[PDB]
Design an enzyme around this catalytic site. Structure first.
Site, PDB file in Angstrom:
ATOM      1  N   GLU A   1      -6.134  -1.623  31.192  1.00  0.00           N
ATOM      2  CA  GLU A   1      -5.487  -0.506  31.873  1.00  0.00           C
ATOM      3  C   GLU A   1      -5.038   0.582  30.904  1.00  0.00           C
ATOM      4  O   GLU A   1      -4.765   0.315  29.735  1.00  0.00           O
ATOM      5  CB  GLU A   1      -4.307  -1.002  32.715  1.00  0.00           C
ATOM      6  CG  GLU A   1      -3.239  -1.791  31.958  1.00  0.00           C
ATOM      7  CD  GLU A   1      -2.249  -2.485  32.889  1.00  0.00           C
ATOM      8  OE1 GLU A   1      -2.692  -3.143  33.858  1.00  0.00           O
ATOM      9  OE2 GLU A   1      -1.027  -2.379  32.648  1.00  0.00           O
TER      10      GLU A   1
ATOM     11  N   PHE B   1      -2.212   5.481  34.306  1.00  0.00           N
ATOM     12  CA  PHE B   1      -1.975   5.228  35.741  1.00  0.00           C
ATOM     13  C   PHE B   1      -3.131   4.487  36.425  1.00  0.00           C
ATOM     14  O   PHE B   1      -3.071   4.230  37.630  1.00  0.00           O
ATOM     15  CB  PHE B   1      -1.695   6.548  36.473  1.00  0.00           C
ATOM     16  CG  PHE B   1      -2.744   7.613  36.279  1.00  0.00           C
ATOM     17  CD1 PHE B   1      -3.848   7.678  37.110  1.00  0.00           C
ATOM     18  CD2 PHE B   1      -2.615   8.556  35.272  1.00  0.00           C
ATOM     19  CE1 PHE B   1      -4.811   8.654  36.934  1.00  0.00           C
ATOM     20  CE2 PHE B   1      -3.574   9.535  35.092  1.00  0.00           C
ATOM     21  CZ  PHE B   1      -4.673   9.583  35.925  1.00  0.00           C
TER      22      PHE B   1
ATOM     23  N   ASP C   1      -8.486  11.881  24.924  1.00  0.00           N
ATOM     24  CA  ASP C   1      -8.122  10.472  24.787  1.00  0.00           C
ATOM     25  C   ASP C   1      -9.168   9.676  24.017  1.00  0.00           C
ATOM     26  O   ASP C   1      -9.379   8.489  24.290  1.00  0.00           O
ATOM     27  CB  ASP C   1      -7.932   9.881  26.195  1.00  0.00           C
ATOM     28  CG  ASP C   1      -7.093   8.621  26.213  1.00  0.00           C
ATOM     29  OD1 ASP C   1      -6.176   8.474  25.378  1.00  0.00           O
ATOM     30  OD2 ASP C   1      -7.342   7.771  27.098  1.00  0.00           O
TER      31      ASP C   1
HETATM   32  N1  GYQ Z   1      -7.878   2.763  33.588  1.00  0.00           N
HETATM   33  C1  GYQ Z   1      -8.210   2.789  32.490  1.00  0.00           C
HETATM   34  C2  GYQ Z   1      -8.606   2.895  31.085  1.00  0.00           C
HETATM   35  C3  GYQ Z   1      -9.663   1.811  30.749  1.00  0.00           C
HETATM   36  C4  GYQ Z   1      -9.062   0.415  30.990  1.00  0.00           C
HETATM   37  C5  GYQ Z   1     -10.047  -0.648  30.501  1.00  0.00           C
HETATM   38  C6  GYQ Z   1     -10.200  -0.476  28.989  1.00  0.00           C
HETATM   39  N2  GYQ Z   1     -10.825  -1.676  28.442  1.00  0.00           N
HETATM   40  C7  GYQ Z   1     -10.213  -2.487  27.551  1.00  0.00           C
HETATM   41  O1  GYQ Z   1      -9.118  -2.309  27.057  1.00  0.00           O
HETATM   42  N3  GYQ Z   1     -10.999  -3.532  27.265  1.00  0.00           N
HETATM   43  C8  GYQ Z   1     -12.159  -3.418  28.013  1.00  0.00           C
HETATM   44  C9  GYQ Z   1     -13.288  -4.209  28.155  1.00  0.00           C
HETATM   45  N4  GYQ Z   1     -14.238  -3.811  28.986  1.00  0.00           N
HETATM   46  C10 GYQ Z   1     -14.138  -2.676  29.690  1.00  0.00           C
HETATM   47  N5  GYQ Z   1     -15.235  -2.431  30.503  1.00  0.00           N
HETATM   48  C11 GYQ Z   1     -15.557  -1.299  31.275  1.00  0.00           C
HETATM   49  C12 GYQ Z   1     -14.729  -0.229  31.536  1.00  0.00           C
HETATM   50  C13 GYQ Z   1     -15.191   0.825  32.342  1.00  0.00           C
HETATM   51  C14 GYQ Z   1     -16.440   0.783  32.856  1.00  0.00           C
HETATM   52  N6  GYQ Z   1     -17.260  -0.267  32.602  1.00  0.00           N
HETATM   53  C15 GYQ Z   1     -16.852  -1.298  31.838  1.00  0.00           C
HETATM   54  O2  GYQ Z   1     -17.614  -2.233  31.631  1.00  0.00           O
HETATM   55  N7  GYQ Z   1     -13.058  -1.896  29.597  1.00  0.00           N
HETATM   56  C16 GYQ Z   1     -12.054  -2.226  28.772  1.00  0.00           C
HETATM   57  C17 GYQ Z   1     -10.913   0.851  28.715  1.00  0.00           C
HETATM   58  C18 GYQ Z   1      -9.969   1.988  29.236  1.00  0.00           C
END
Ligand code: GYQ
EC number: 2.7.10.2
Length: 294
Positions: free
Chosen positions: A31, A34, A143
Site C-alpha cells: 500500500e 490512500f 513518486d
Molecule cells: N496503492 C499503492 C502503491 C503500490 C502498493 C503495492 C506496492 N508493492 C510493494 O510494496 N510490493 C509489491 C509487490 N508486488 C506488487 N505488484 C503489482 C503492483 C501493481 C500492479 N501489478 C503488480 O503486480 N506491488 C508491490 C507498489 C506500490
C-alpha cells in the site's frame, strides 16, 4: 393485451469490465498513501483457473484521484510501464497485470547473486525510457522510488504505480501541489521541498535516488531515508525537512554506493544539480548508461 416489455439488443461483453462477484482476493501486495494493491484471481468459471491480476483500491473524497489515476494508466502504452487491464465498478477498483517477482524492494535483496552491475544499468535505462515516455505525454510522476518499480523478469522492469502522477499544462514547465503531507521528502528535489513545484527535472532527481537504491539492492540500512537521517540528524521531527533543504543547499548528497564505479556515480550526481535546468535529461542518462554497457 399481454405485458409489454423491452426487447434489449445483443450485449457485447467488455474485457476491461471485471465483475465484482468473480474478483477473488488472494493476498496483499502492499500500500501507498490512500491506495492498496491486492493479488486477486478473476475467476468467472469458479475453478481456480482464472487469470491472476493486481487490483488497486482505496483504503477506508479520494475516489476522484483514483479515477484520474485510472484514466492516466489506461492511456499509457510502453514496455516499461505496467499494463492496465480494466476496472471493477460511485466506487471503483483498478485492475492491472500481476508481476509475480514483486517490486525491486523485494526482488533485489533476494537476487544479489544473479543481478550484476550490467543488469542494474539495463534496469536503469528501462526506468529512464518509461519515465521519458511519461514526460513525452506531459506527466510528472512525483513518486519515483524502487518500491514503485516492478520486476517483469530478470531482464525487465516496469514503473508499476502512478498514484501521485499529475499533468503539466501545455506551455508550462511545472505543476504546483497543495496536498503534500505524505510526501517522500528523501526522494524529493529542492524545488519540491521548498516551493512545492514539480518539473520533469524533479523526476530526474528522484530517479537519481532510485538509481542509488538499485545499486545498493534496496538494502534498508542503506535506504535514502536511513542515509539522509544519518547525515542531518534522526530526532528533529517537524524540523526534519528544513535541515534536509539546508544539507542540499550546502551541496551535500547521498554517497557513492559500495562497488559502484565512479563513472556510474557521476551520472547519478548529474541528476542532483540543485537548479533543475542544470540537471541531466532522461535521454542523456540513457546515452550515458548505454556507453557504459558497450
Ligand atoms: N496503492 C499503492 C502503491 C503500490 C502498493 C503495492 C506496492 N508493492 C510493494 O510494496 N510490493 C509489491 C509487490 N508486488 C506488487 N505488484 C503489482 C503492483 C501493481 C500492479 N501489478 C503488480 O503486480 N506491488 C508491490 C507498489 C506500490
Amino acid at each position: 393485451g399481454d405485458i409489454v416489455s423491452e426487447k434489449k439488443p445483443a450485449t457485447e461483453v467488455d474485457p476491461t469490465h471485471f465483475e465484482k462477484r468473480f474478483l477473488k482476493r488472494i493476498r496483499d501486495l502492499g500500500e501507498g498513501h490512500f491506495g492498496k494493491v491486492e493479488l486477486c484471481r478473476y475467476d468467472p468459471e469458479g475453478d481456480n483457473t482464472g487469470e491472476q491480476v493486481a487490483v488497486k483500491s482505496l483504503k477506508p473524497n479520494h475516489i476522484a484521484d483514483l479515477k484520474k489515476e485510472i484514466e492516466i494508466l489506461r492511456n499509457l502504452y510502453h514496455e516499461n510501464i505496467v499494463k492496465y487491464k480494466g476496472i471493477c465498478t460511485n466506487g471503483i477498483k483498478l485492475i492491472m497485470e500481476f508481476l509475480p517477482s514483486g517490486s525491486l524492494k523485494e526482488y533485489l535483496p533476494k537476487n544479489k547473486n544473479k543481478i550484476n552491475l550490467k543488469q542494474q544499468l539495463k534496469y536503469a535505462v528501462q526506468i529512464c525510457k518509461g519515465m521519458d515516455y511519461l514526460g513525452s505525454r506531459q506527466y510528472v510522476h512525483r513518486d519515483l522510488a524502487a518500491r514503485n518499480v516492478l520486476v517483469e523478469s530478470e531482464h525487465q522492469v516496469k514503473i508499476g504505480d502512478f498514484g501521485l502522477t499529475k499533468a503539466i499544462e501545455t506551455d508550462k514547465e511545472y505543476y504546483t501541489v497543495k496536498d503534500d503531507r505524505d510526501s517522500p521528502v528523501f526522494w524529493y528535489a529542492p524545488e519540491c521541498l521548498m516551493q512545492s513545484k514539480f518539473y520533469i527535472a524533479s523526476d530526474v532527481w528522484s530517479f537519481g535516488v532510485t538509481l542509488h537504491e538499485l545499486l545498493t539492492y534496496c538494502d534498508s540500512d542503506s535506504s535514502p531515508m536511513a542515509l539522509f537521517l544519518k547525515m542531518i540528524g534522526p530526532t528533529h521531527g517537524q524540523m526534519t525537512v528544513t535541515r534536509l533543504v539546508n544539507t542540499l543547499k550546502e551541496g551535500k548528497r547521498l554517497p557513492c554506493p559500495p562497488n559502484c564505479p565512479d563513472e556510474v556515480y557521476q551520472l547519478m550526481r548529474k541528476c542532483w544539480e540543485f537548479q533543475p535546468s542544470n540537471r541531466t535529461s532522461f535521454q542523456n542518462l540513457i546515452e550515458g548508461f548505454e556507453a557504459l554497457l558497450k
